[PDB]
């Protein structure tokens, strides 16, 4: 089997991407944030405290004929930006781009944090990291991808994120029309549960590629590109108007700049982000100062290849028993 689904920037910044998923019988369609940096399918639901729901679409399990209470199971999660939700656990039929899974764990929020309430466009999260990161106890869990793997034509899914446009998530096959050149594969480490890989260095603009190991995770659920302090400082030192803002919290530059490209290595291969990907947006509507799309990871503890990198590439998540990561240019 295979599936395919249009994914959609939630705003004009590419702050995040949402994807329609059908849950239950007759399907309820919810707009979920596909997140390869966590492994919980959690939704807004009829169980959510009401003063905490705010425009979102909700999952009603009682209205689905195929929902079953997962007795005794609860979950709690918190993300890197400090937001959080908890509640209890159903299994139910879940469908993504015509790819259907049964007795998939759907995690039902009883409470959500403020950031989630205030975010009207995202109805919940589909976690696509490894299943060890799943928060449901007493037994975790296991993601959509894992549940699907047995029926997939290939134990694989691809991320095709568009710049200021729609894109594609595919499961079970690889679309050869979707990129240019060949995929280079790199080794994954599942030690921390992440899509964790090691970049072989970087170049800024037209200058020299520098061979240095950059350990980092590929993370569709993170907006920006976070790199070590000395790599990021080396980029922004090419942009004449760029300074680090304490108040705004990272590198800003004049919106009028033309930014240099940034190349990261994958094995012997190179992936170039266009300078335009890295102009993130004005810090206020009508500002002359913009917020940069590459920031320091020093406060975070790990490097994140997030949306700014990934939407520059056709990215292949190969979940064979030894997982690897694929990059093509597009
Ligand atoms: C607007 C912004 C200034 C650019 S922002 O940084 O707030 N963007 C958010 C994403 C977002 C999209 C749309 C609307 C609102 C917010 C963002 O980048 N969130 C990061 C926070 C971060 C990391 N570094 C610096 N900041 C995050 O938590 N991302 C997780 C997925 C997100 C969570 C918020 C909702 C959208 C999905 C994540 O899973 O990808 C993660 F990897 F970052 C993460 O925190 N994974 C948590 C891993 N858990 C830990 C507990 O054990 C199990 C595993």
UniProtKB/Swiss-Prot annotation:
Top-level EC class: hydrolase
- Name the keywords, alphabetized: Aspartyl protease, Disulfide bond, Hydrolase, Protease, Signal, Zymogen
Q: Which GO terms describe its molecular function?
A: aspartic-type endopeptidase activity
Q: Active site: which residues? A: 35, 199
> Which cysteines link up through disulfide bonds?
255-290
Known catalytic reactions: Hydrolysis of proteins with specificity similar to that of pepsin A, prefers hydrophobic residues at P1 and P1', but does not cleave 14-Ala-|-Leu-15 in the B chain of insulin or Z-Glu-Tyr. Clots milk
One GO biological process term: proteolysis
- Source taxon at top rank: Eukaryota
The record places domain Peptidase A1 at 17-328
Q: What is its EC number?
A: 3.4.23.22
Task: Say which family it is in.
Answer: Belongs to the peptidase A1 family.
Q: What is this protein called?
A: Endothiapepsin
- Gene that encodes it: EAPA
């Amino acid at each position: 089997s295979t599936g395919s689904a249009t994914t959609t920037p939630i705003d004009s910044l590419d702050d995040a991407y949402i994807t329609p998923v059908q849950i239950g019988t007759p399907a309820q369609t919810l707009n979920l944030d596909f997140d390869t940096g966590s492994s919980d399918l959690w939704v807004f639901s009829s169980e959510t405290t009401a003063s905490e729901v705010d425009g979102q679409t909700i999952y009603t399990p009682s209205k689905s004929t195929t929902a079953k209470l997962l007795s005794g199971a609860t979950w709690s999660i918190s993300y890197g930006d400090g937001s959080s939700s908890s509640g209890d656990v159903y299994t139910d039929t879940v469908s993504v781009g015509g790819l259907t899974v049964t007795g998939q764990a759907v995690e039902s929020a009883k409470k959500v944090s403020s950031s989630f309430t205030e975010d009207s466009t995202i109805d919940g999260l589909l976690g696509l990291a490894f299943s060890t990161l799943n928060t449901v106890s007493p037994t975790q869990x296991k993601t959509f991808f894992d549940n699907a793997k047995a029926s997939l034509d290939s134990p694989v899914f691809t991320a095709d994120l568009g710049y200021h446009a729609p894109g594609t998530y595919n499961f079970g096959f690889i679309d050869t029309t979707a990129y240019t050149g060949s995929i280079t594969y790199t080794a994954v480490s599942t030690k921390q549960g992440f899509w964790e890989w090691t970049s072989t260095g970087y170049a800024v603009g037209s200058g020299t590629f520098k061979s240095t190991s950059i350990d980092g995770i590929a993370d569709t659920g993170t907006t920006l590109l976070y790199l070590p302090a000395t790599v990021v400082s080396a980029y922004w030192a090419q942009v004449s108007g760029a300074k680090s803002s304490s108040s705004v919290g990272g590198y800003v530059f004049p919106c009028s700049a033309t930014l240099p490209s940034f190349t990261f290595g994958v094995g012997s291969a190179r992936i170039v982000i266009p300078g335009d990907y890295i102009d993130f947006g004005p810090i206020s509507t009508g500002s002359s100062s913009c917020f940069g799309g590459i920031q320091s990871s020093a406060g975070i503890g790990i490097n994140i290849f997030g949306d700014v990198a990934l939407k520059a590439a056709f990215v292949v998540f190969n979940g064979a028993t030894t997982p690897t990561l694929g990059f093509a240019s597009k």
